[PDB]
Paper text:
The housekeeping enzyme glucose 6-phosphate dehydrogenase (G6PD) (EC 1.1.1.49) is the first and rate-limiting enzyme of the PPP. It catalyzes the oxidation of glucose 6-phosphate (G6P) originating from glycolysis to 6-phospho-D-glucono-1,5-lactone (6PL), whereby the cofactor NADP+ is reduced to NADPH. In the present study, we describe the crystal structures of Leishmania donovani G6PD (LdG6PD), both native and complexed with one or both substrates. The LdG6PD monomer contains three domains: an N-domain (Q5-K49), the NADP+ binding “Rossmann-like” domain (residues D50-I248), and a β + α domain (residues D249-K552).
To investigate a potential function of the helical N-domain conserved in Kinetoplastida G6PDs, we generated a truncation mutant lacking the N-domain that includes residues 1–59 (LdG6PD60-562). Crystals containing only NADP(H) diffracted to a resolution up to 1.7 Å, and crystals containing G6P or G6P and NADP(H) to 3.3 Å and 2.5 Å, respectively. The crystal of the truncated mutant LdG6PD60–562 obeyed C222 symmetry with one monomer in the AU and diffracted to 1.9 Å. In contrast to the wt and LdG6PDC138S crystals, which contain the physiological dimer in the AU, the truncation mutant LdG6PD60–562 crystallized in an orthorhombic space group (C222) with one molecule in the AU. Consequently, the physiological dimer is formed by a crystallographic two-fold rotation axis. However, our usual tetramer cannot be constructed via crystallographic symmetry operations. Instead, a different tetramer is formed via C222 symmetry operations, which interestingly resembles the G6PD tetramer of related Trypanosoma species. Here, the LdG6PD dimer–dimer interface is mainly formed by salt bridges (R268, K324, R326, D335, E336, and D393), keeping the dimers in a back-to-back orientation. In accordance with these structural results and in contrast to the stable dimer-to-tetramer equilibrium of LdG6PD wt, the tetramer was no longer visible in the SEC profiles of LdG6PD60–562 but only a single peak corresponding to the dimer form of the mutant. However, the crystallographic and SEC observations were not reflected by impaired catalytic efficiency of the enzyme. Only minor conformational changes of the core domains in the crystal structure of LdG6PD60–562 confirmed this when compared to the wt.
Author numbering:
A (entry chain A), B (entry chain A): 62 to 471, 480 to 550
The structure:
Amino acid sequence: KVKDEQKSRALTIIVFGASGDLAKKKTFPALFDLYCGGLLPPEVNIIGYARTKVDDVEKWKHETLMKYFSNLSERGCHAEDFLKHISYFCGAYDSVDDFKRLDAVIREKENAFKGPEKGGNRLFYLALPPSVFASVCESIHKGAMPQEVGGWVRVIIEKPFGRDTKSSAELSQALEPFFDESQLYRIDHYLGKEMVQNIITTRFANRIFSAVWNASNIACVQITFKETIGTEGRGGYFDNIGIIRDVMQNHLTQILALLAMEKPRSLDAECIRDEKVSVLKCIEPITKENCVLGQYTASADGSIPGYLEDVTVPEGSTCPTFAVMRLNINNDRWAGVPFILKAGKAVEQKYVAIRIQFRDEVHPYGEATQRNELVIRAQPSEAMYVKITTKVPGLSGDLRQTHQTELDLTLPDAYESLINDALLGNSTNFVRKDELDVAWRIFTPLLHQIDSGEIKPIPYQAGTRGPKEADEFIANNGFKH
Amino acid sequence: KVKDEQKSRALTIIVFGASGDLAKKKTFPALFDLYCGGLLPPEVNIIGYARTKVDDVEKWKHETLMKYFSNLSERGCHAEDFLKHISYFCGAYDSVDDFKRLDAVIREKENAFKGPEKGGNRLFYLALPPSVFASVCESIHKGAMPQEVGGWVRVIIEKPFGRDTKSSAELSQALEPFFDESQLYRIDHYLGKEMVQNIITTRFANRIFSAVWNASNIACVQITFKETIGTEGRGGYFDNIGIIRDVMQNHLTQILALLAMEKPRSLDAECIRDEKVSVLKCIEPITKENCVLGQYTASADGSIPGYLEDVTVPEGSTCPTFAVMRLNINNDRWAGVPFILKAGKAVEQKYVAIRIQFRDEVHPYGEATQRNELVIRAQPSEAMYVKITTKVPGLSGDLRQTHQTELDLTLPDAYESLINDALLGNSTNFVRKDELDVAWRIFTPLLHQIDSGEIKPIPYQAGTRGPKEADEFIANNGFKH
Ligand SMILES: NC(=O)C1=CN([C@@H]2O[C@H](COP(=O)(O)OP(=O)(O)OC[C@H]3O[C@@H](n4cnc5c(N)ncnc54)[C@H](OP(=O)(O)O)[C@@H]3O)[C@@H](O)[C@H]2O)C=CC1
Ligand SMILES: NC(=O)C1=CN([C@@H]2O[C@H](COP(=O)(O)OP(=O)(O)OC[C@H]3O[C@@H](n4cnc5c(N)ncnc54)[C@H](OP(=O)(O)O)[C@@H]3O)[C@@H](O)[C@H]2O)C=CC1
């Protein structure tokens, strides 16, 4: 129903900052993949908008944009024909007159649309530093809103969404005069549709999983983000960010919210967003006593230079490349259950997954059983499985002769499916304004304690698991191997 | 540990009624299979005991017993060497002097045992009509008990265990002066170890299944025993028994007890038997309003003669070949949950299984989900699986695009493993004296109502599902397709 309406009205996608790194390496290639997948509607118009002068727009499309398209050998005809949908407007983000001129250009394309509904839908993409967001949103609101006869406007917001409670709220307050929460889409490129549907459907559609998704049945929950790569020579940019702002306050926290939320009143996006916010509001701010920090030194092989070795890293930096922490959710469903977030650079393997350990049934099987588990993995590939105890056929055939059995419960990438979600009006995986403020309030006191030097990272060789105090902390906070 | 002690002392197996149908067609071939499997200890002595004169015991072993052994082409050397363990005592079941003579014969074999412990273990098997049980048990107690220096005695009791509360209690009272409940083994040939371990381990070893095994989570439970065969020309013997005494009051009820029991204090056999009895005590007697009876007429193909067509069936018999019934378990775990027992001859397929339907999660998935299920099947082959709702990958990728997924949770036959259980001292799958009386009290008021004509069977063509009022009853008592 939603896709039929998508084809019934003109569509324009406006990429601000189209001259930039993100736009050419990620955003336009993602639109190309959606186009090749048949997920953009037939006469979509795509307008790059930036200050950089481009004297030859065809040359820019072919020599700059096209070289970042994947599988170009097999897709040359698609690439050439995708490029015909793309134009370039060289203009200022802060000019009323330029946005009237842009609006004229868009309306001409909209009024030529050969389908049945009038006006047009407009998706604006801010591939810009956040310091430019307020200015460009003001310009859109003044001069490039959809035609009165019809059409929605949506604006995709890039990160960072501030860097603490105060800075993030200032940015939200700067944009809310122009766009409400049905219009702003704050994107996390890494939250895939596959994982979210695994989290939501496997629990809420099923009595068996619904009934055990609580503190009476779950011993501990861990959400883990592991990478073998280090900061890859860009340690200077990472140094002002750190592992926690990088992936934990935003990416792992949204996964936690979807995992822990109460049942939504319906499967509508904003009902799910309401439940994300409601469960995050039950989390007290993380304490320094519940956080172990790491910072990676060079690998034993020598092939991974340590973090401090980077020329761009300020001498004696204490910025964390690794963190494990415990969050307490204080409500009926979760009180007493440890929620462990772990994220690390330059560790022993690449791996992103949820691991839920259920409480052991000590009686009557004793050592012939162990905790059941549920695992939802996204990297290095999708998997979802349950581990349980089953009988062993044959003999001596004692009831105590048991085995651990794995039950397996189980295309655009995550970024492409989120752009598609935005085009289809599905805000589920995007962070809402209230949701964002609650998440910053969970993490900012800890971040202030880190910036004050109250906590300092433990070194770990690149390629190891991380500091061994981290595994100690995990073992002391509910997890059993 | 138990098997090591089995090899440490002499063992004698005494088959009373060894001249009979059961002994030659089933019991001795089952001992042969256990011998071929390595489950009998090396110098086991087997003594057939009966009144029938046998002038040539080697001829009887080779021409009568051996022809019922399975796979005889591939096992000729095993069969010949198994037969050397077998002797025959022609004697009376009611003679003190004969049992002194039998005891002498057994003691000579026991005292020649080359292992470390003295005396010997004695398993007596009553392959006799139950009218002879009290006499032979009296003779054993008087004259053939194990030697004082060491050894247990066990006695396997064949069915029928009475035919109502009063007759069954009279038989129990007749045997209890001679053997207690650690010594009597009342055998149900059809209760396999594989199914029982599936019932017990899958639930009690696992938090996930333990937590949902109750009325808060289960909508209905059905236990089903289906056969395509009819009474096979022996309708006269079946006519005095009926489908309920045949398989429901005994076989399906023990499965129900294992399914519904509370957690046993340990995995010890008598702890499980205690819980079987305790849950059966919570069942009120079955009412005629909760029972649909059937009796099969001839198949449409003609190849299955109807039940009344049998020459041996009394004219105008109302004996049921089919029954569906609802049992109510009135305790905290099960109050309000329908338990449906179904058993039928000459129906559309051969099938024995447990089907547990969990309560639907109406919200939020609505018609995009359905009741989860757990199925434990024994016939026509073992299987155990769970049915749940999962996401469908790809697009349009709506949360409401779901699929029903089957999770698969998964050698002597059932009779052979029960003889082995008896030899190893494991009474789990055998009906205890108190257990039996409670089960007869659940069924006898209904059986009296049937014998009075208060309920009469509905005809159904052989090869169909049974009377359609039966499927109506099932649908009206909690089950949804
Ligand atoms: N892979 C990436 O690059 C990642 C970046 N992001 C976020 O996406 C957004 C874009 O990232 P990225 O492309 O790397 O950033 P850039 O520094 O490359 O800026 C993108 C474009 O924005 C314009 N721009 C830069 N600075 C200013 C300024 N002071 N005033 C006006 N315009 C400016 C420039 O275009 P012009 O001069 O032509 O107007 C520039 O080409 C950022 O918010 C970033 O934090 C998130 C995921 C990863
Ligand atoms: N497949 C089967 O046969 C099934 C039978 N059962 C039960 O197993 C037991 C044996 O069954 P089955 O072999 O068919 O029964 P039978 O009628 O064949 O009797 C078995 C032996 O017991 C002796 N016997 C029979 N009647 C008497 C009597 N009045 N007094 C003394 N001895 C008697 C006879 O041996 P002798 O004259 O040499 O002493 C007979 O050969 C029964 O309890 C039966 O209900 C359960 C499963 C299926």
